[model samples]
Target chain A: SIHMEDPILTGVAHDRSEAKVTIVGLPDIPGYAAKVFRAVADADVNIDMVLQNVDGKTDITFTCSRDVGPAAVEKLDSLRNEIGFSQLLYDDHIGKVSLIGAGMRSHPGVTATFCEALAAVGVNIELISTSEIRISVLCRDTELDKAVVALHEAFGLGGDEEATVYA
Target chain B: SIHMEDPILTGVAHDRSEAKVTIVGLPDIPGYAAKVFRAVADADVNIDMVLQNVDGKTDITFTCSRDVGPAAVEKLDSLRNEIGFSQLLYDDHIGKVSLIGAGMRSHPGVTATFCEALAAVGVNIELISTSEIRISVLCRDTELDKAVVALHEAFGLGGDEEATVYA
Candidate 1:
């Protein structure tokens, strides 16, 4: 079996140390997204996942390290009149749980299985981002432990070294 | 030797697609950094390396994907008066060359050797950032190729077959 030589799947990594920021009702101009991100970059904050939906006006959302939320809010408040946005929202009660595995690149249905496990536990995903080898989901900080446990069990990540593999 | 089992060092990665932005003379208050980064985060730009110096007034510098430079400037220009910054600078003619290796974390003098290689090529570093496994430096976009070649040679990444090791 390919599983015999494949790099085995590993455990999940949980990070409960980020904050979410949303800019509501931004004008969907050509350079609008660029403008908002430029300011945050200037402040030297590293951003995580970003999502944008343009319904008439645009609502842009992103996440960063939690401690920098207040600074981000204050910076945006100064530009509210000039950028002409509706409201700014920041949430610090969020956590990101990521499933990391090099083998996932060659394995199909891993994402589906991961999501199903989370859904079974009633953990609502607020934002999601993925790389070829990683799937990260944002959820309420309070629910992180339950999500972690559910994922650990779903991936068969516990017990002896041999039990950690699904094959 | 541990070298038999250790991961081999790979070639450098060069990104000639990012721009640099700097904010000069910002007040070094408790929440100022947060404010500046918050704005950029909202715009959804992924920031690369960040450097901040507190000399009398604070100077914050960072880099992002090149095309986002103008957008970041526009966002900051709109907040110039409100944020009380003396100057905002954006340079699109820049590149980032990073040396990445998981083994670099345990090896000493990687940074020194990496910088020496760059210095030998007469490349001037504008900003620098490092992680346990990576070291990235910002340099002139025009000189990116020369820097890349120098690093490749320095790391002995010229041959084939065994060149692609640690797989």
Candidate 2:
């Protein structure tokens, strides 16, 4: 028995446990992405946001927990020759700040508001991933606090007042 | 300026706008995974929680926001022969409920507690994915609310007291 009407944006949530991993100059072919995530998954490292840019060659980037980053890197490094990637780079200087809301699925402009809020604060969004109810942005670990505060205000979530609902 | 100390579990977050997409009988080889996600990315659909099982062949399952699922499926379906996949599937009867906590990273029993709470309530976890601070479970769309309530109580989050920082 449940009775919640709208999806509420739980204020800004931040995590510093994530590290960025990039496989540079990967072949932009089928099965390559699978191989990369499969190896990381086999190592018990759960991947978060994933982004791939194809410019003749593909560069794949994803985020995983810091504790599992080294192990995942090792797993990929060992297969570098077999997979034919140029280089595997891992950066621990990254963090994720997310705005999670169930109601956002019905509301438009949340992403725009979020990005504008962050951009206003001079926070550069490096990578972004979203689900129907969540929007997460990756930025420098050092600027996470600023990012959080900016988003918290952007959604008017600093107070207990209900967020404006849109049709 | 930052002033928050412990990680707090953002109460039950629900997503009803996600649909499951599967590529059946994909060749279990490198580059195949890349091909699937690349198409989805090109279609501007963000994916969440991916699972690939390989027996003799491979099957890839991933979830994306429902609004974009059709576009992604259409893009992949058109490339079916080129990608060499057997079938494409999209399921809209699924929903996701997530328990997110930055503090859970240090709390060892979070997963067990979360699963137990849902199981006790007769909610079956269909698919699961996690980050360092979040645990998201996919269940029958109809059972999502119950799962969220069960988890809320399991963590003693029903009250205003800060979640117990278990050692």
Candidate 3:
């Protein structure tokens, strides 16, 4: 599997193993989106898909990757006093697994089955988003391990037990 | 006049009839983005247009509107201990008066004329975001009124006492 280290900006990731995830907290205000983005720009971080929750309650939630988390959090954390938030949370150990294939669209039930398999294993789904080619889910550390195994069994997603190289 | 108000989420306003602007300030760093947005989600605030400045030698300036400012800042500011910024600058008195029409695209000098009119009157443009069909400019409290008056006259957008209508 391909692996990426820390500090990732926004870019297309062919391999999830090479990407980092981050979640940000902020005031539920209008222009703050620009503020956070400007920080990212200052850090010269290329932000990929940014997910934000609505400001219905008292707080909002956002997620990125571990690569850009440090820079993003550093830039935004300073405004805490004025912006006003309780706290921020980061989890690099959290693993994100996805079923990345163009064929998934033809087989829609795969996602539900995947979720069901995770539920069977008592694994919880934290955050989920989808596109034409990808379906990503975030789960706890151990939960992720269980989910992956269950998914492998449910969808036959497992590959050769050993590594293979053309060389 | 239809008097209606709904809980807003994602305060970015793309239409003149349904538009809003926000401004906020925070430190420039990593993970800070998470602190603010998480708060926004918790509060259930709808965020729309977001703008921020690059990290400067001293501090980074950020802005958002009432639409997003309240809840977003709550979450972000709460995490100030971890994510730190000097202050959060929020200005809601800022009003937006825009010229919304597609007829100006064919005229290349429209923007020049628009700016000249406002400049001649010493009106300052605080925030400006443009689209093919619209030109959005945010000005100071006094400047906003003056700019609107000048623009209305310059673009022949003023309404007069012509009540005669013919089918």
Candidate 4:
């Protein structure tokens, strides 16, 4: 039950395939973390992010992608009695805003610009995790479109008319 | 940990081969059972009769044959603090008895007979486990000759006499 990092992607493609969204909520517990991944791993599923956090007293927002959806849902549904969760949600239209940059030390405003652009768009951030070169955010598929458009304008990625933060 | 009732034999067929023993106790945890075997399997060490039972509250007893002793103990010892266990025991001069027959189903008297013989010879039974075709008992090596003779006689598998029970 582990995630693939750069090691698994050495000399491999950068982007992922067949991306979809699934959300789990309500009554989260600790040890179930391993159990959740264990089921996926046992079913030979490769996964990414696998983010979850405390939402309310009885609810937590957790997300996994569609690659492992069948096994994850099968395991969760079968084990629902053991792992108490109120409902499961699936959203296939979501995309990701990976702030991939290594110069955060020399370049400071990039992260703030990224977050501010999302704030301007009023997109509710679900959960966030960080790595040295990346900041991942889980959000609705629809909001992802708006946030990326705003951030692309803010950072000037993939367009000429947009602001050129780098290069 | 689940104890198996299989037998694995190892010893140099050539003369003057020295023998050693190793006993390893693994934590009475869940995946540790699969871990030990998987590691042993990876090491290509053929293991046998993993007779074990959790103290049901605290620890567990995992016993295998001398064949996989060195590798098994090494793997388990390194994982000691991680997988909590009370202790590990080793015995090189440990004679092993593996009763092979399907007679255990309708008749359990054979088990009593074997135990009685070992008790009468004052052999210390270190581990015992059963399988479909085998029942293994670990005892002091000194009693090997005598125990084998007695069991052979009791079960009519003895010197100069053929086995009377066919099935």
TM-score of each: 0.47, 0.49, 0.39, 0.39
Error of 4 at A89 (Å): 46
**Candidate 2 chain B least-lDDT 10 residues:** B1-10
Which residue ranges in model 1 land beyond 4 Å of their true spot?
A1-167, B1-8, B158-167
- Candidate 3 wrongly placed segments (more than 4 Å): A1-27, A45-49, A55-60, A64-68, A81-86, A103-108, A158-167, B1-167
lDDT, candidates in the order shown: 0.65, 0.68, 0.45, 0.45
CA RMSD of all predictions = 15.8, 12.3, 17.2, 21.9
State candidate 2's DockQ.
0.04
**Of the candidates numbered 1 and 3, which has the greater TM-score value?**
1
Query: Fraction of true inter-chain Cα contacts (below 8 Å) kept per model?
Result: 0.00, 0.02, 0.00, 0.00
Candidate 2: where is the Cα deviation over 4 Å? Answer: A1-7, A158-167, B1-167
Deviation in Å, model 3, residue B122 alpha carbon: 24
**Residue B42 of candidate 1: its Cα lDDT?**
50
Give the range where candidate 1 chain B is weakest over 10 consecutive residues by summed lDDT.
Answer: B158-167
Q: Is model 2 an incorrect, acceptable, medium or high docking prediction?
A: incorrect
Q: For model 4, what is the C-alpha lDDT against the true structure?
A: 0.45
- How would you encode candidate 4's per-residue C-alpha lDDT over A1-167 as one tens digit per residue? 01111111001012222243333553433334334444444454544443332253222223345566565577657777655666766554555555554322222234334455666677644433333234455556667667667766656554322222252
Tell me how far the alpha carbon of residue B27 in candidate 1 is from the true structure, in angstroms, after superposition: 1.1
TM-score of chain B of each: 0.84, 0.86, 0.57, 0.67
lDDT of 3 by residue, B1-167 (tens): 01012111111122222223222344433334334444444555544333333243122222345555565566656766755565655556565556554333333244445555666677654544333234455655555667777776666543432111101
